[PDB]
Enzyme design. Structure first.
Site, PDB file in Angstrom:
ATOM      1  N   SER A   1     -23.567  31.601  -8.271  1.00 43.95           N
ATOM      2  CA  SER A   1     -22.616  32.317  -7.179  1.00 43.95           C
ATOM      3  C   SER A   1     -23.171  32.288  -5.893  1.00 43.95           C
ATOM      4  O   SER A   1     -22.819  32.029  -4.896  1.00 43.95           O
ATOM      5  CB  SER A   1     -21.899  33.624  -7.531  1.00 43.95           C
ATOM      6  OG  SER A   1     -20.975  33.228  -8.654  1.00 43.95           O
TER       7      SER A   1
ATOM      8  N   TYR B   1     -23.545  30.173  -2.995  1.00 43.11           N
ATOM      9  CA  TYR B   1     -22.197  30.055  -2.312  1.00 43.11           C
ATOM     10  C   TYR B   1     -22.187  30.757  -1.051  1.00 43.11           C
ATOM     11  O   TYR B   1     -21.580  30.775  -0.139  1.00 43.11           O
ATOM     12  CB  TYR B   1     -21.058  30.199  -2.876  1.00 43.11           C
ATOM     13  CG  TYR B   1     -20.620  29.136  -4.142  1.00 43.11           C
ATOM     14  CD1 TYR B   1     -20.316  27.890  -3.688  1.00 43.11           C
ATOM     15  CD2 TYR B   1     -21.105  29.494  -5.391  1.00 43.11           C
ATOM     16  CE1 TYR B   1     -19.982  26.798  -4.525  1.00 43.11           C
ATOM     17  CE2 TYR B   1     -20.695  28.311  -6.190  1.00 43.11           C
ATOM     18  CZ  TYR B   1     -20.273  27.161  -5.973  1.00 43.11           C
ATOM     19  OH  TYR B   1     -19.904  26.317  -6.840  1.00 43.11           O
TER      20      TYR B   1
ATOM     21  N   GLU C   1     -18.463  28.055 -15.984  1.00 42.86           N
ATOM     22  CA  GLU C   1     -17.337  27.868 -14.918  1.00 42.86           C
ATOM     23  C   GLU C   1     -16.212  28.598 -15.429  1.00 42.86           C
ATOM     24  O   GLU C   1     -15.557  27.949 -16.622  1.00 42.86           O
ATOM     25  CB  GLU C   1     -17.357  26.355 -14.640  1.00 42.86           C
ATOM     26  CG  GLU C   1     -16.805  26.200 -13.225  1.00 42.86           C
ATOM     27  CD  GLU C   1     -18.180  26.174 -12.226  1.00 42.86           C
ATOM     28  OE1 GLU C   1     -17.955  26.727 -11.095  1.00 42.86           O
ATOM     29  OE2 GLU C   1     -18.941  25.619 -12.397  1.00 42.86           O
TER      30      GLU C   1
END
Length: 345
Positions: free
Chosen positions: A234, A237, A322
């Protein structure tokens, strides 16, 4: 002048900075000059999404001719890109659709952020968020756990950096507690990362699904909300750099319920739920249940990443899990980590 704990003040100054917002779009090849952000309207964005669909339509029908070319021109017109003198690329792949979708998504939050930066300024903004950010006691057990989860789930594959937990703020978005829906199993505390300039929009509007105008194939598992059990998965991102050394990643409760396990991507995955409440992209590596711990009613997958045993018989095997839910009411933001990335060089 007005007062709020200095930490909350710092945080807001960080995510409210209009400069950084500009920087971010430019870094995305978006032409801020020929299309000032301050003039960006929600209608323009929706326009861009539709152009992409048209492009998806061509790619779908194998039409890589004039049909496609005209569609790109339309889109590049609707959403001005700065390529300098270079000739714009003709979008003709799903992977690229996916990138343009992420661009429009950012614009969507920039639109929101600006429409909110309009009685101390920060204090005023904090209200406009309708989201509570109480600093966390760096001695609280919560902190110790958040920190342990953060480090223990930093994937091996991401060694180009290290993470130092600057601070943690507990989030409380108006209406999530009530709507959350505690009836579902697999109530997990999962990661979600994003660029700084996105955070104002995420805090005020919460995490939300992609619009219906958006091309479905630009979403790995359909129009849902994505999470990960690997902090670094994560954190990537955040698109933090050596200069943008500070980033933020969110940690929230996600009521997964029955998961529909998928080995490989599928933009149309939402349709295949048929009762299950979320899609799970089976990764080759993830926390071990044997290491799970419970925090305030939610399971924390902190156990060091281990091999899951999943292995696509013929095809790419996802590295890490995911997670996708298609309803906001299956999400409840809890903590927002302020992280300092330490690259290597």
């Amino acid at each position: 002048e007005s007062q709020l704990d200095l930490r909350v003040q710092e945080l807001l100054k960080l995510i409210c900075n209009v400069q950084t917002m500009e920087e971010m779009m430019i870094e995305m090849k978006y032409d801020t000059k020929r299309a000032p952000l301050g003039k960006l309207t929600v209608a323009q964005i929706k326009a861009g999404y539709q152009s992409l669909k048209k492009i998806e339509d061509c790619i779908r029908a194998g039409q890589h001719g004039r049909a496609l070319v005209e569609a790109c021109n339309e889109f590049y017109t609707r959403i001005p890109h700065d390529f300098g003198l270079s000739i714009p690329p003709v979008i003709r792949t799903e992977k690229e659709l996916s990138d343009k979708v992420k661009l429009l998504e950012a614009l969507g939050d920039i639109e929101i952020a600006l429409k909110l930066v309009k009685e101390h300024p920060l204090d005023q903004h904090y209200r406009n968020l309708h989201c509570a950010l109480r600093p966390l006691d760096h001695e609280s057990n919560e902190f110790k756990v958040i920190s342990q989860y953060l480090q223990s789930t930093h994937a091996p594959t991401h060694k180009d950096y290290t993470m130092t937990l600057l601070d943690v703020f507990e989030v409380e978005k108006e209406g999530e507690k009530e709507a959350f829906r505690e009836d579902l199993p697999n109530r997990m505390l999962l990661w979600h990362g994003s660029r700084l300039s996105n955070w104002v929009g995420i805090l005020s509007h919460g995490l939300r699904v992609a619009p219906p105008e958006a091309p479905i194939t630009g979403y790995m598992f359909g129009k849902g909300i994505y999470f990960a059990d690997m902090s670094s998965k994560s954190a990537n991102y955040c698109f933090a750099s050596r200069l943008k050394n500070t980033g933020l990643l969110l940690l929230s409760e996600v009521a997964l319920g029955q998961c529909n396990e998928l080995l490989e991507a599928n933009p149309k995955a939402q349709g295949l739920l048929r009762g299950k409440h979320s899609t799970k992209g089976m990764g080759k590596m993830a926390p071990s249940p044997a290491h799970f711990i419970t925090l305030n009613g939610s399971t924390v997958p902190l156990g060091p990443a281990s091999d899951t045993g999943i292995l696509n018989p013929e095809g790419y095997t996802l590295n890490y899990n995911e997670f996708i839910v298609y309803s906001p009411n299956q999400v409840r933001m809890r903590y927002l980590l302020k992280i300092q990335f330490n690259f290597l060089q």
